[PDB]
């Protein structure tokens, strides 16, 4: 039914309005919030525009998903923190709502080009519930330190999206798709998202960091991790390609793995050289993931990941969690090691279980899912111009 999407959008928005009326009441961090905002809406949105015939869906559904997600995440996270009571909206609420949007967008990267906007609304709602509850578990029960959210945003989003993509597996797409390909100017547009993510990641990892030494450390460590990651991502992209050519997939994504991998340790006293080591390993891991593990996942494990979010958010997120465990073992922070391990395990496990449930809901033939031939094509859901 063509009216499923507008009805769902309007009903969800009315529910948001009623919840805000029931539960919500009314400046130094506002610039950091705006940096995070740019990463959410321009960073991810344009990062996903590499697909030659899916640019409209990538950027626009990014906008739609994130707009819904910030409202719903505001509500869910606020109710969790208030234990069902009314709560006030600060700058921190806005930053955390943007983080919930980022988690959903990471998951979206796994199923990009194979889902409808209606499916993405449903996924936003369910995934934000699961993500918020895991994040509450990590912050308040375990009391683990994950300031950059390597486990709670990146690893969670990656493995949730992978579980959904696994449930939504299409046998017809295992060997590839004519539409699943980049274009020259499309890769150019994707570099815009890459550059904004790279530029503003230090604000991402430090926005809610405790003011003072922890926030300064978050900024500096994130910056140097990303600087090292750029060099290693370029080097390993050249290393794994015929005749040393550079691969735009690698330069668009693996250059950001430093931001993900240093997230758990960002506010810890790991020193710039420690942050650089983490970034270097992350760039390497991301490029190797894109080159060797994504084909393995798609063909043998039947888990197709359109944007290779496992290589940017999943494996580097796991690496960041492991780095947090090790850093605790070296005294770099006062948090328990067992709680870091528990946070990593809970993030991955909750992501997988919730992703399976959500994908089982998304698998119902009621959401206008594209046919196999029409995957990665804007024209299913958009009026497409007649020339490029």
């Amino acid at each position: 039914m063509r009216f499923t999407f507008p009805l769902m959008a309007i009903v969800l928005e009315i529910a948001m309005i009623v919840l805000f009326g029931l539960f919500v009441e009314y400046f130094e961090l506002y610039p950091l919030f705006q940096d995070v905002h740019v990463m959410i809406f321009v960073g991810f949105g344009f990062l996903m525009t590499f697909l030659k015939k899916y640019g409209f869906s990538s950027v626009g559904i990014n906008l739609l998903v994130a707009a819904l997600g910030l409202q719903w995440g505001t509500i869910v996270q606020g109710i969790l923190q208030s234990q069902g009571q009314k709560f006030n909206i600060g700058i921190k609420n806005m930053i955390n709502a943007d983080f919930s949007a980022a988690t959903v967008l990471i998951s979206f990267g796994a199923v990009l080009g194979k889902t409808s906007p209606t499916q993405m609304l449903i996924m936003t709602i369910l995934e934000i519930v699961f993500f918020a509850h895991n994040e509450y578990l990590v912050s308040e029960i375990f009391k683990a330190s994950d300031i950059g959210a390597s486990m709670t945003i990146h690893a969670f989003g990656a493995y949730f999206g992978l579980a959904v993509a696994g449930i939504l597996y299409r046998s017809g797409l295992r060997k590839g798709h004519e539409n699943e390909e980049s274009a020259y100017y499309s890769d150019l547009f994707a570099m815009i998202g890459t550059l904004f993510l790279w530029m503003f990641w230090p604000s991402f990892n430090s926005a809610i960091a405790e003011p003072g030494d922890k926030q300064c450390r978050a900024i500096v460590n994130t910056y140097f991790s990303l600087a090292a990651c750029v060099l290693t991502a370029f080097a390993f992209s050249s290393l794994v390609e015929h005749r040393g050519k550079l691969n735009m997939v690698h330069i668009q994504n693996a250059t950001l793995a430093g931001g993900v991998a240093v997230g758990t340790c960002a506010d810890m006293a790991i020193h710039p050289f420690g942050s650089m080591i983490i970034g270097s390993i992350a760039g390497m891991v991301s490029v190797l993931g894109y080159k060797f593990l994504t084909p393995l996942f798609t063909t043998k494990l039947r888990i197709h990941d359109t944007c290779g979010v496992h290589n940017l958010h999943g494996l580097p997120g796991v690496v960041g969690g492991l780095a947090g465990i090790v850093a605790v073992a070296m005294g770099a922070s006062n948090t328990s090691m067992a709680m870091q391990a528990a946070a990593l395990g809970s993030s991955i496990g909750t992501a997988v279980v919730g992703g399976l449930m959500t994908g089982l809901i998304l698998k119902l033939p009621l959401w206008g899912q594209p046919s196999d031939q029409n995957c990665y094509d804007d024209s299913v859901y958009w009026k497409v111009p007649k020339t490029r």
């Binding site: 604000s203 290693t232 390609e241 735009m248 020193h271």
Partner: protein, 380 residues
């Protein structure tokens, strides 16, 4: 010789990974860590970073088939240059305490290289640009150190000469390279880069200004000079083009004109009308350079070189108002240009070495030389 690029599958990874390993080791051995205005101070460095990666990265993306290389190589160059600049600034200005301020200064050092690279982009591969980054950051550091030793200025404050050093270093390196265009969509992406440069340039004109009043006045002067310069460049472009049309490529560079013109004196300009006068004169010089220099390789780089020189000249014309100091400032400028040209010649001679596996002159301005594309025959 073969016009087909030689495999860099061993050169480039070994070079980049050895560089990053060396940088990590040096950071481990020589760098060390360490309030109310943390976010305020961070935002200036973030503006510089945006201007470096987005601004300069996309500004040179206008080429028909070299946009990927421009953007991505600019990112790689920034990542290398900031780490190296941290180490070099520490070594020549004392262990290295890493602060947000030191990151900001290192970013400025990196942007000097990024501006210089515009003269050579499309004619070099990544390894050559690594060499250029290392040598140029080192040469700028040496120039600042020599100025500090001779004229008793601060090492960090001598980074004011960055625009004139960058313009002349890039020109010399370009002059050394073997001897050899636009599209609509890359032109629009380059406009995005140019706009971010134009918008955040006031942050270039006051990173190094400690006091608030000087920062405020410098920002105001840069903003108004830039406004005047954009209007002169778009309006006067029609005059400096054979077909009487506005040139997008000309606009991309000429928008900055007033920024560079007031770069080294905006803290000394006491009223906005004078900054606007300098912006107008910078724009008019930009039109004149576009129209005249080609008769006498990159034209925008050449006009920038005049504009940086114009900027020092107006700094001299002003510093007296606020003649031995004139002699000292002319000597400082001459030493800056001399070192820029000499280190640029050395860099160009190094870049010409065979081991870099540089692109064939028939293959300049092509992403296909450096990037993977589908449905291509590969190898032999």
């Amino acid at each position: 010789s073969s016009k087909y690029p030689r495999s860099v599958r061993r050169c480039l990874p070994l070079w980049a990974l050895t560089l990053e390993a060396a940088l990590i080791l040096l950071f481990y051995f020589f760098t060390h860590y360490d309030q109310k205005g943390l976010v305020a101070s961070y935002q200036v460095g973030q503006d510089l970073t945006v201007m470096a990666a987005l601004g300069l990265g996309f500004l040179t993306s206008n080429f028909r088939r070299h946009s990927w290389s421009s953007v991505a190589f600019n990112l790689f160059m920034l990542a290398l240059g900031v780490q190296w600049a941290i180490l070099l600034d520490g070594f020549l200005s004392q262990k290295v305490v890493i602060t947000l301020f030191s990151i900001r200064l290192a970013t400025m050092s990196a942007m000097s290289v990024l501006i210089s690279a515009g003269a050579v982009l499309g004619k070099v591969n990544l390894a050559q640009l690594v060499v250029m980054v290392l040598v140029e950051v080192t040469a700028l550091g040496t120039l600042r150190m020599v100025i500090s030793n001779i004229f008793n200025t601060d090492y960090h404050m001598n980074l004011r000469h960055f625009y004139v050093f960058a313009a002349y270093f890039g020109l010399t390196v370009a002059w050394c390279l073997p001897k050899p265009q636009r599209a609509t969509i890359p032109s629009l992406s380059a406009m995005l880069g140019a706009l971010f440069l134009w918008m955040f340039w006031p942050s270039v004109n006051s990173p190094l200004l400690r006091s608030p009043i000087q920062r405020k006045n410098a920002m105001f002067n840069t903003y108004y000079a830039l406004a005047v310069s954009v209007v002169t460049a778009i309006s006067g472009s029609s005059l400096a083009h054979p077909q009487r049309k506005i040139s997008m490529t000309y606009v991309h560079s000429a928008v900055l004109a007033g920024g560079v013109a007031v770069g080294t004196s905006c803290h000394l300009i006491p009223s906005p009308w004078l900054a606007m006068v300098l912006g107008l004169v910078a724009g008019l010089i930009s039109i004149g350079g576009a129209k005249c220099l080609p008769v006498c390789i990159s034209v925008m780089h050449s006009i920038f070189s005049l504009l940086g020189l114009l900027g020092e000249i107006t700094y001299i014309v002003l510093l007296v108002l606020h003649g031995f100091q004139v002699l000292l400032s002319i000597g400082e400028l001459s030493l800056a240009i001399v070192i820029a040209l000499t280190s640029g010649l050395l860099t160009g001679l190094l870049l010409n070495l065979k081991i870099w596996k540089a692109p064939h002159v028939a293959k300049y301005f092509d992403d296909q030389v450096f990037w993977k594309f589908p449905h291509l025959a590969v190898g032999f």
